[PDB]
């Protein structure tokens, strides 16, 4: 009953509409910018924004390339 928008999770899709538990929509999926309820108020507004998502969602692993190269140097002094 939700529209998923991210894929780096355990079961996060982007174009499948799944039926999940009621508390899993309320407290996690909706308030994190990660879904919206299956309403027909902007369901045709999703279809005019299908090519704005293909920019930032692809750099999401590309900006995690060189940022990860300073995460494993282990240069924190205790």
Q: Which of residues 37-66 bind another protein (CB under 8 A)?
A: 37
Q: How far apart are CA 18 and CA 6, in angstroms?
A: 14
Q: Least distance (Å) from RNA to the CB of residue 6? A: 14
Q: Which of residues 20-49 bind RNA (CB under 7 A)?
A: 23-24, 26-28
Please choose which of another protein, RNA, none residue 42 contacts, taking the beta carbon within 5 to 8 angstroms, the exact cut-off set by kind. none
Dihedral angle sign, alpha carbons of residues 48, 52, 13, 19? negative
Q: How far apart are CA 1 and CA 36, in angstroms?
A: 8
Which residues in this chain contact RNA in the complex, by CB under 7 A? 23-24, 26-28
């Amino acid at each position: 009953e939700v529209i998923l928008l991210e894929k780096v999770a355990n079961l996060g899709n982007l174009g499948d509409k799944v039926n999940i538990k009621g508390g899993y929509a309320r407290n996690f999926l909706l308030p994190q910018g990660k879904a919206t309820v299956a309403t027909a108020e902007n369901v045709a507004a999703f279809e005019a924004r299908r090519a704005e998502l293909e920019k930032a969602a692809a750099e999401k692993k590309a900006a995690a390339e060189a940022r990860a190269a300073q995460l494993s140097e282990l240069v924190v002094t205790l």
